[PDB]
A = this chain, B = another copy of it.
Amino acid sequence: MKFPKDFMIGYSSSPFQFEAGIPGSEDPNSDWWVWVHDPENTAAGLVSGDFPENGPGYWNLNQNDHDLAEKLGVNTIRVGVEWSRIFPKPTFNVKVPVERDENGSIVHVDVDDKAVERLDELANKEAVNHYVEMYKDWVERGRKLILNLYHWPLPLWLHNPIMVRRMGPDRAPSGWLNEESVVEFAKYAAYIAWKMGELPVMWSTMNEPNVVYEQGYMFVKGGFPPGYLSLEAADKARRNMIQAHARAYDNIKRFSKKPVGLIYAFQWFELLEGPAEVFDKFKSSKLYYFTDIVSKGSSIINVEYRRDLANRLDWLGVNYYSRLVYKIVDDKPIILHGYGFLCTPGGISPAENPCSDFGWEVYPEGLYLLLKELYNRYGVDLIVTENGVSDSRDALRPAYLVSHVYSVWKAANEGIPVKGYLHWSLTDNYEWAQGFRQKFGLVMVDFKTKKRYLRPSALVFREIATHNGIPDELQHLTLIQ
């Protein structure tokens, strides 16, 4: 009931949700910053009203959190870098060659040493140096760092969310709806690879890209920018994000021969008795479309094979929280509320499973099933880059932690190459549109004083990290809540 020698155990974080908190560390130059400070979004209830500047303040407290992490047995951490802190001003003018196929696809972006030297002139050195400083503080402790380049926020010069909602995508800097975002992201990737390449053991181009376009252009009641309902816009954004990844991959490899992958949000799909295999297609079209393209260069019923997109997934980051259950075959399976992410805060699902403060059903088995299926589908190394639960009372986290770590063990014990488990957040943080009311930390944070408090789950985590597995004395928590 122990993991391999070099198995990575730790947690993940993002720039936007943890950095700000102490005066002077804000990043007012991103779409998300403007979006959550917007009066109309607030009045409408799209955003909670809480501010990132009142966050945990990792930008200033990094050293103390790293010590806390180390005290709990964290040996590996996955972090990101804000595009907008690195390039507050537009990088549009740094030309760079861009190869386009017959259909307008950006099959190649060439960012050479001169371009990088030029980008380095536009970059915000204070931020760049501060990132190296924070991450070097963790790495020089003899610990591993996984660096993710993108975790949602976009620079305002690239995306003006408010203007996109009022005027339409065609009359405003439209973020991922602007194909040039691909080129700019590629330049940003090369620069980071060249500047911080020595720090990480692995790279990740982006975090849950699917959530960005699904929330921003489909599930608009979720409060994600630009909140512009349009399936057409969603597909466009998805398309450019897939390209942005492929191009970022090429450019990172030019300055860093380290593994380059992608962190993705996977819900474990499920349905009726033996309805049909029409579900498999369903899953291929919505759940596995994106990772299929960036690995195989194609997807379901679509001969198209793009070489510039294929073979660009050295490892796969798995963010797992719960499941999604559907009904009916026909040609349209439908979502059943009361299951997975569609439960009530603190409630119980029809399957007798407890639900988080977010109203997400605790379902550890899904992680097990997800991992096996991913490996059979892609055969690539996997890392649980995110797994946790909104639970301010810590009434679920302890069991939730042991349950999912077990599912990971079970998968590894069966040969699945899962290289590590990273818990979502060591500390509470800014839960995007939801604000601070959603607490995922193993460590509670008083956002007024910025003090960190250990929740009992944190103690449980230390036992697991220290034992590099689940000690017999904690085997009972592989069950439920």
Contacts and interface: CB of A to CB of B under 8 A. Distances in A.
A218 B40 CA distance: 7
Interface stretch (A185-193, A367-375, A390-398): A390-398
A464 to B, nearest CB: 11
Interface string A378-410: 000000000000000111001100000000000
28 contacts: A39-B231, A40-B230, A40-B231, A41-B229, A43-B218, A43-B219, A44-B219, A45-B221, A46-B221, A46-B229, A166-B230, A167-B168, A168-B168, A393-B395, A393-B399, A394-B398, A394-B456, A395-B395, A398-B456, A451-B475, A452-B473, A453-B475, A456-B456, A456-B457, A456-B459, A456-B460, A459-B460, A459-B463
A168 B172 CA distance: 12
**A-B pairs, 8 with minimum CB distance:** A453-B476, A456-B456, A459-B459, A395-B395, A398-B456, A454-B473, A221-B221, A167-B168
A229 B44 contact: yes
Given A46-B221, A452-B473, 17 more contacts: A39-B231, A40-B218, A40-B229, A40-B230, A41-B229, A43-B218, A44-B218, A44-B219, A44-B220, A44-B229, A166-B230, A395-B395, A453-B475, A454-B474, A456-B459, A459-B459, A459-B460
A159 to B, nearest CB: 17
Interface string A207-221: 000000000001111
A165 to B, nearest CB: 6
Interface string A452-481: 111011011001000000000111110001
Interface of A: 39-41, 43-46, 165-168, 171, 218-221, 227, 229-231, 393-395, 398-399, 444, 446, 451-454, 456-457, 459-460, 463, 473-477, 481
Contacts of A39: 231
A288 to B, nearest CB: 19
Nearest to A40: B229
Residue among A231, A459, A475 facing the most chain B CB atoms (10 A cut-off): A459
A444 B40 CA distance: 39
Contacts of A167: 168
B446 A46 contact: no
A481 B395 CA distance: 10
A45 B229 contact: no
A428 to B, nearest CB: 11
Contacts of A166: 168, 230
Nearest to A41: B229
Contacts of A165: 229
A46 B221 CA distance: 7
Contacts of A230: 40, 166
B231 A43 contact: yes
A68 B221 CA distance: 40
A448 to B, nearest CB: 12
A81 to B, nearest CB: 29
Contacts of A399: 393
A446 B475 CA distance: 11
A459 B220 CA distance: 43
Contacts of A44: 218-221, 229
B476 A446 contact: yes
Contacts of A474: 453-454
